[PDB]
Amino acid sequence: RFLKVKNWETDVVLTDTLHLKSTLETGCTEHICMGSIMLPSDVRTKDQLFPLAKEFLDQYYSSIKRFGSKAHMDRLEEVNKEIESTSTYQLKDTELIYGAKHAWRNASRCVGRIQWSKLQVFDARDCTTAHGMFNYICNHVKYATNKGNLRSAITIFPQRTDGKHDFRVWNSQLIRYAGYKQPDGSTLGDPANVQFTEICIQQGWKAPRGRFDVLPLLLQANGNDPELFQIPPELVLEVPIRHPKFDWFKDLGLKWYGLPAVSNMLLEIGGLEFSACPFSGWYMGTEIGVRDYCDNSRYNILEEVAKKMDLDMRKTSSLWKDQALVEINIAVLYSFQSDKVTIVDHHSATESFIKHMENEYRCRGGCPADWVWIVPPMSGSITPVFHQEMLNYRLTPSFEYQPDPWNTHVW
Amino acid sequence: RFLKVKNWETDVVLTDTLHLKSTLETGCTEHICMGSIMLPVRTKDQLFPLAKEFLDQYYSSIKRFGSKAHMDRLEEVNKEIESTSTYQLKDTELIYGAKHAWRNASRCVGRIQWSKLQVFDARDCTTAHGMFNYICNHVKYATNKGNLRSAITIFPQRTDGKHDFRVWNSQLIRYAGYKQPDGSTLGDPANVQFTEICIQQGWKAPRGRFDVLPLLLQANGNDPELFQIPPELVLEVPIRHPKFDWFKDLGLKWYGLPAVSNMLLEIGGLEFSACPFSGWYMGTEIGVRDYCDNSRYNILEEVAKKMDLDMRKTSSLWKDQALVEINIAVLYSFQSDKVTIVDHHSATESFIKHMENEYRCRGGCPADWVWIVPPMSGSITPVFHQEMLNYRLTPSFEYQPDPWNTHVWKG
Numbered sequence A: 001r002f003l004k005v006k007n008w009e010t011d012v013v014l015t016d017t018l019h020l021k022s023t024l025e026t027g028c029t030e031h032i033c034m035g036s037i038m039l040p041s042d043v044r045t046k047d048q049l050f051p052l053a054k055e056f057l058d059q060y061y062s063s064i065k066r067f068g069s070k071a072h073m074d075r076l077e078e079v080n081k082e083i084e085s086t087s088t089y090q091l092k093d094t095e096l097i098y099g100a101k102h103a104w105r106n107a108s109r110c111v112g113r114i115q116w117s118k119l120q121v122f123d124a125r126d127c128t129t130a131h132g133m134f135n136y137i138c139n140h141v142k143y144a145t146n147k148g149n150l151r152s153a154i155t156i157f158p159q160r161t162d163g164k165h166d167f168r169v170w171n172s173q174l175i176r177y178a179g180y181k182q183p184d185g186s187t188l189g190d191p192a193n194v195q196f197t198e199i200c201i202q203q204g205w206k207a208p209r210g211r212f213d214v215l216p217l218l219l220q221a222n223g224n225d226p227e228l229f230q231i232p233p234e235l236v237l238e239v240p241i242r243h244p245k246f247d248w249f250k251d252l253g254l255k256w257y258g259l260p261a262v263s264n265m266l267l268e269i270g271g272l273e274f275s276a277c278p279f280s281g282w283y284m285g286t287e288i289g290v291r292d293y294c295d296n297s298r299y300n301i302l303e304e305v306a307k308k309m310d311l312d313m314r315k316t317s318s319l320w321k322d323q324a325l326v327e328i329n330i331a332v333l334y335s336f337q338s339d340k341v342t343i344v345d346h347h348s349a350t351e352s353f354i355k356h357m358e359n360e361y362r363c364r365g366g367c368p369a370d371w372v373w374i375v376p377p378m379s380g381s382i383t384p385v386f387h388q389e390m391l392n393y394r395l396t397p398s399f400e401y402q403p404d405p406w407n408t409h410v411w
Numbered sequence B: 001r002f003l004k005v006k007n008w009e010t011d012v013v014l015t016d017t018l019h020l021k022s023t024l025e026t027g028c029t030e031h032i033c034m035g036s037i038m039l040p041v042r043t044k045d046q047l048f049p050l051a052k053e054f055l056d057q058y059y060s061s062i063k064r065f066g067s068k069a070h071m072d073r074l075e076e077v078n079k080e081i082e083s084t085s086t087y088q089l090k091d092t093e094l095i096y097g098a099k100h101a102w103r104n105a106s107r108c109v110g111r112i113q114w115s116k117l118q119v120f121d122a123r124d125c126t127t128a129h130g131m132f133n134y135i136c137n138h139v140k141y142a143t144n145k146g147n148l149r150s151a152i153t154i155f156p157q158r159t160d161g162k163h164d165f166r167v168w169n170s171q172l173i174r175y176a177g178y179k180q181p182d183g184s185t186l187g188d189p190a191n192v193q194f195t196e197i198c199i200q201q202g203w204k205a206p207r208g209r210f211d212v213l214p215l216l217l218q219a220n221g222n223d224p225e226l227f228q229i230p231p232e233l234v235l236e237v238p239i240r241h242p243k244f245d246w247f248k249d250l251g252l253k254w255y256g257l258p259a260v261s262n263m264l265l266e267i268g269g270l271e272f273s274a275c276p277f278s279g280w281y282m283g284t285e286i287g288v289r290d291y292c293d294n295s296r297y298n299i300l301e302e303v304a305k306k307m308d309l310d311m312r313k314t315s316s317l318w319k320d321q322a323l324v325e326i327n328i329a330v331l332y333s334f335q336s337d338k339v340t341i342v343d344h345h346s347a348t349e350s351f352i353k354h355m356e357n358e359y360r361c362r363g364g365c366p367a368d369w370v371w372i373v374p375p376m377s378g379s380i381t382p383v384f385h386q387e388m389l390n391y392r393l394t395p396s397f398e399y400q401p402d403p404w405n406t407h408v409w410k411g
Ligand code: HEM
Pocket: A104, A107, A109, A110, A111, A112, A113, A115, A119, A152, A153, A154, A279, A280, A281, A282, A283, A284, A287, A344, A349, A373, A399
């Protein structure tokens, strides 16, 4: 039970002991593996909270080489007393930064984790209003965008108290394109965002009804009704998509935004639940070119591109979809690189992740990793992660999924 | 207890109850997922329950459960076990078992075909020469002048583990590989170790780039013997590209018949250690893995050079572009020569239909996402978006150790 993972391309064997620190559950059993299920899975009682805090503070003081020290025991006692009285507790800034960086470090589905320690943490726990949230988010977007030299960042709004006063960003990402159902049956814009684009309109948002309309922010503070805000356009950096060989590619009229900023997850540190914690990095090209542009349930541009390439679209075995998919992804990378906007291709990112795995096994004893999500959605087996065995287990602090607010909110 | 899987592209939800019939273990636990691990002399004691379970399944399928034929057969097997320590399957039971081992193969995307398997009973075989004759007839039947037919040939079951029948080849038809003194490899790197054993056993190697390996066959626990498959039985396809006239000059060819020969077939507790089976290729097995794995023929560089791509930086996706062209050439060559092949779009679409049908008529379809998703263009195939449950059912195909590591040499 000191498990080993083999890379079948290189025969490198790593030994994993970190999984024995794991606490939460995978969803699998000895009789059935749920590793391809998208998502397995109210306030914390006074009891379950102190063990959670103790375990977190134990690993925090170990990381600063002060395990079993005066400061350690004192902080343990201090939090112990705060919980006994207040039925919760507040993190020190140092603890908050550590917790957020390690929630990313532990995100087994994230291929970009070699960067985990270079995370800018914005403490927004003093925020009280949607207008305040808007201000914090604009500052985040501007800092992270950095005129195309993207920088990772997270903004952490106040923690859940009793489930009635939740801070929530209702958008799934800070920047996403609208989607509208057409009278004929098709969809203009992003089909993934049709219900959200409806809620915004069904809320007051005057939609331009374009193909790439930046959605408004929909911000919930202290559990009140959410509020619409328009992100200043000069803060939304966008890349027009063109192809270094094909001039007609520009004519397609495609663009995408530079900042991937996920805003609907829940950050758990020491038992405390941060329901509003938008975070951002930079794109891997396939997220746009493969999934955003070519998923059948998204922009689904594959037919158009192949047609303009004059490919034989009559039989699947001509691999016209594969041919078009590559060209699309060459264009995305070329466009971002041309406009000096940070982006990583899937070969670079998976090579980086293999090196990160080696680092984590060496300096930490392991790295939880979800093969189903780490292997890119194109050209899987020519990237080094395809041939890498991975162990998936759930460490804390962590980012977790949470329900969509409009299914919960007492309106 | 019921379980649901969701297709996130179509929102189709399916309900699995078949996992309740699962006996064997997955390797996972509630605290770790081993879903990406490649690999996670039975006694009288444990054998009759395994037989009973199989015969219950068998007689259920023919709608004779609890019949006099069912009960008599159970008695007959029981007495045969207690008296002879093992038992013999009827021909009907063997055919059923072999088909269901394929039906239960959670890593196999081609299972829509499972009920159309030609089963060759080779349980009367006694020598390696007899094995050679049985395998030649299998290859001729399966090849069928390019109109491939699925087949399996089943040699005698294990007795005391000291008299195993084994096919030492990993596949019936495979190309030799030769490590050169300068560190380079001629032929197929995947087969260097086996090629060496063959050469040691007296095989005169042509030392070419595409040399069909000899069969190395072990009967009744004796030392294995070498045989050369008649070249007229080995159907091969020269690889050319439909637009690139220079592709032929790469000098590539591949064999037509994929015939895995190193797995163990388990039926009712009986172990068939030699059970070669064959179907037909999905194009990506050759074009992605065989040709473009860095640890295989690895022709990506040559193809990319002859296409004159930007090979300086990976973000030009020269590797991705060359991969698509190679896979176009594989499918084009096979189809032009009327040798059965299936592209990864057709094969995955069929699997989804198979899987839905299995959920309807059987209550489930165990499936290993990590293996079902093709090694290129993963997300533009429908299985990428399909949730799957993996669990172990019997009859089954299992891995077994390579014989050269366990064999006791006679001299
Ligand atoms: C800096 C560059 C980064 C890159 C290239 C990157 C890349 C990726 C990719 C490709 C995925 C798969 C998601 C999908 O395919 O839709 C992913 C997932 C994820 N990323 Fe990273 N990421 C980066 C930064 C970050 C940061 C800064 C955080 C948090 C602070 C983070 C947290 C996560 C999490 C939690 C997931 C998995 C979500 C889930 O469980 O479903 N990532 N990332």
